[PDB]
């Protein structure tokens, strides 16, 4: 009989939602409202690359904070110098449908994949001399969406077949699937331990994963539509979703629920790509009103704009050392902020 | 100059880079993209047969053209989550079966088939990437419709419709619902052909179709719209 | 990877030569070449330089006007064309390959060379150590001087370390005085301020002796050394 499962599922959702309530004492809100104000943060574009023919999805920074990696529609993966316009590498894709592209910790493999449900792993570092396919991940049942570099051998991927999963690039194999989800799946963020990774879907639900166990550890629920982009605090303790009902959440693995609501009502348009700043301070949001929003993590105040993009910011990542944020949005120009 | 030797030979890389990616846009540029919809067996194997994993890029040449026909039909996910990467396709060949008036989807018998066309027209007809793109309609299985017309009766479709049972009122009727269908007239344009089973006439009307995009979109850039 | 070239020969004085470079193993046509020269018993000295399609081309001081380079990108081979050729252009010329971007480690191969005989302001950086008895497990410190500081504005320093083994193509050890080179036992290290440089064996091998040679890649005039030579 399903109704006494159903219930006992009722029964533990009330649960949960009261062990929460009675964790929620004192709103994040109350405890920042005695801080210095960020201010007003203003960057200016100091280096945009042209190269692009098609809508640019996804991009990385490489761990140096010079190297750049973008993917778009027009089959090419480029890998940028930032500090001086300069391509070093142009891949050409199998498939130009790409959604996702990650640059491996160590520089030496690329990461691309997309609506042909394929991981596909680029040697860069070959005594060729030219970027070839070191391995062709294949298993996801859906679209690519996230794809990071746990190291030179392991990769989690996001799809869109509700599942996430972990391969060993050497095998090209699914070592772990991390099943759970209700939508899919759009977006994945590393912990800077490596051993925890969240993964946000189109369930609205965010849900924290251990790399080593392979099963769920925490589900947050906080949104009213699908959550597009996820990013890890620098800290680790603490993440940020954002959805497009326009709106941005900041969860705590410890507490597992909402710290903070970022949103503004001029604001209508979802949310495309967030990324931290290196102290966690600064929350940064790609929005679909072609603008970038830098949003303060403690206070929800709209630090600044980062306007400059003619078409929706799609992706928007951080150097490691954070001295720079790149904005790479569908008018097919990458622009780098500081 | 202030820029060392190797300095200097990277840059000079990156202007290579630079013109093979200029080439392979203006070669990408003059040839036409195509994105295939239809709901359940539409047809599309058929259609693809005739003009020679989540994507079948199916690549083919007509009179001086390259064709890129992009299948989206094994994705299985949420179309809104990846239909936006298709905007800019130059149009959108939408395949409806007529033989499908009378037949009910395996689950939700309540629902035709037909039905399930003409939602998913109007999903993708007026949807907000779509709205420049125009839609070259397909309505296939054209000797199994005629036939099914024979004997059985439109109305299990259409409860609205008043005229007779023969070929050409009753593909009329469908064909004039399929692009009243379309809220947005205004910018879009929906080219209907009935699938034959001769030669290249198809294809034909794709190549006409696409030529018709091609010179629609060349006076927009040169702003005579 | 393979860069096997042809010519060479005895030659008359005054005469012509072509020396061709095939190349096999790797993307040729993203790979600047460079020519190289050894006399029987000198150091080595640059010839000539050929970028990614053929837009820039430098030649030396000796070479410019009598030699021409050019190369063949469809065909995979490299082409050094000899005019007015005399006695001090008897060397075996090596074929170099060198790609060019960030991160990356030019002159990582050198081809086995061919031996020409001919029958009868820029930087300069010296290595007074020359040859220098040594003995296997211990630390050897290779120095070279730069007559003018290799360090640029943009943090990298240009200076490059070789090794030819008796008989052998010489190898790229350490580039941009720090970056150990693909396939290099971990043993070697360099380090330098500008002007000075040293490279550091932490321990010998058997396999490690040869000639040690540093380059200088700041100022297209390519510059080598005399060559510290290593004895046991």
């Known amino acids: 009989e399903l109704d006494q499962l159903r219930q006992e599922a009722e029964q533990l959702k009330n649960q949960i939602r009261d062990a929460r309530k009675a964790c929620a004492d004192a709103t994040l809100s109350q405890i920042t409202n005695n801080i210095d104000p960020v201010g007003r943060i203003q960057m200016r574009t100091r280096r945009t690359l042209r190269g692009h023919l098609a809508k640019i999805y996804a991009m990385h920074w490489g761990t140096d904070s010079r190297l750049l990696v973008s993917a778009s529609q027009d089959g090419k993966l480029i890998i940028w110098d930032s500090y001086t316009t300069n391509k070093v590498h142009a891949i050409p894709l199998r498939s130009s449908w790409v959604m996702t592209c990650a640059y491996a910790p160590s520089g030496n493999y690329v990461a691309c994949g997309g609506l042909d449900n394929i991981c596909s792993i680029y040697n860069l570092k070959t005594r060729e001399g030219n970027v070839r396919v070191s391995r062709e991940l294949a298993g996801h049942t859906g679209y690519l969406s996230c794809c990071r570099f746990l190291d030179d051998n392991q990769i989690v991927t996001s799809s869109g077949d509700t599942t996430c999963a972990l391969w060993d690039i050497e095998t090209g194999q699914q070592t772990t699937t991390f099943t759970g989800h209700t939508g899919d799946v759009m977006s994945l963020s590393l912990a800077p331990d490596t051993r925890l990774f969240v993964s946000g879907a189109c369930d609205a639900s965010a849900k924290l994963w251990d790399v080593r166990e392979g099963m769920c550890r925490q589900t947050f629920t906080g949104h009213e539509s699908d959550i597009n982009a996820i990013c890890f605090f620098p800290n680790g303790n603490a993440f940020a979703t954002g959805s497009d009902d326009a709106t941005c959440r900041l969860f705590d693995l410890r507490a597992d629920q909402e710290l903070m609501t970022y949103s503004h009502d001029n604001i209508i348009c979802g949310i495309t790509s967030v990324s931290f700043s290196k102290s966690g301070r600064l929350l940064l949001a790609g929005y679909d009103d072609f603008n970038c929003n830098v949003w303060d993590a403690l206070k929800a105040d709209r630090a600044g704009v980062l306007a400059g993009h003619d078409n929706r910011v799609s992706c928007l990542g951080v150097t490691d050392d954070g001295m720079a944020v790149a904005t790479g949005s569908w008018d097919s120009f990458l622009k780098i902020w500081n | 100059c202030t820029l060392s030797a190797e300095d200097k030979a990277a840059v000079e890389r990156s202007k290579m880079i630079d013109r093979n990616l200029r080439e392979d846009g203006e070669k990408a540029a003059r040839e036409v993209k195509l994105l295939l919809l239809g709901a359940g067996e539409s047809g599309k194997s058929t259609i693809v047969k005739q003009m020679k994993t989540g994507i079948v890029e199916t690549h083919f040449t007509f009179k001086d053209l390259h064709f890129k026909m992009f299948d989206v039909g094994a994705q299985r996910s949420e179309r809104k989550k990846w239909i936006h990467c298709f905007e800019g396709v130059t149009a959108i060949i939408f395949c409806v079966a007529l033989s499908d008036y009378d037949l009910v989807l395996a689950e939700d018998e309540e629902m035709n088939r037909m039905h399930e066309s003409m939602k998913l027209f109007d999903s993708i007809c007026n949807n907000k990437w779509f709205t420049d793109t125009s839609i070259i309609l397909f309505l296939n299985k054209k000797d199994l419709f005629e036939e099914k017309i024979k004997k059985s009766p439109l109305t299990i479709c259409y409860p609205e419709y008043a005229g007779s049972n023969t070929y050409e009122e009753a593909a009329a009727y469908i064909q004039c619902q399929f692009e009243d269908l379309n809220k947005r007239k205004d910018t879009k344009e929906i080219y209907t052909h009935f699938t034959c089973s001769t030669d290249t006439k198809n294809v034909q009307f794709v190549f006409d179709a696409v030529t018709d995009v091609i010179i629609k979109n060349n006076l927009k850039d040169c702003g005579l719209f | 990877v393979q860069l096997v070239e042809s010519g060479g020969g005895l030659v008359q004085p005054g005469g012509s030569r072509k020396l061709s470079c095939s190349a096999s193993?790797?993307?040729?046509?993203?790979?600047?070449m460079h020519w190289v020269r050894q006399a029987p018993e000198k150091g080595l000295e640059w010839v000539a330089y050929i970028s990614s399609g053929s837009g820039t081309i430098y030649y030396a001081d000796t070479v410019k006007g009598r030699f021409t380079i050019s190369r063949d990108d469809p065909k995979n081979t490299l082409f050094l064309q000899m005019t007015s050729l005399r006695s001090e252009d008897t060397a075996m010329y090596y074929c170099?390959?060198?790609?060019?971007?960030?991160?990356?480690?030019?002159?990582?191969?050198w081809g086995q060379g061919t031996t020409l005989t001919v029958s009868s302001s820029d930087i300069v950086m010296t290595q007074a150590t020359s040859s220098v008895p040594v003995t296997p497990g211990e630390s050897v410190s290779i120095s070279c001087r730069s007559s003018?500081?290799?360090?640029?504005?943009?943090?990298?320093?240009?200076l490059y370390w070789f090794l030819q083994r008796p008989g052998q193509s010489p190898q790229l050890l350490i580039y941009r005085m720090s970056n150990l080179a693909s396939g290099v036992p971990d043993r070697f290290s360099g380090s330098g301020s500008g002007t000075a440089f040293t490279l550091t064996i932490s321990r010998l091998e058997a396999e490690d002796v040869g000639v040690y040679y540093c380059m200088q890649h700041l100022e297209y005039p390519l510059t080598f050394g005399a060559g510290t030579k290593l004895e046991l």
């Open positions: 193993g790797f993307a040729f046509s993203s790979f600047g």
């Open positions: 003018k500081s290799l360090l640029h504005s943009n943090g990298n320093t240009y």
């Open positions: 170099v390959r060198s790609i060019y971007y960030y991160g990356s480690s030019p002159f990582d191969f």
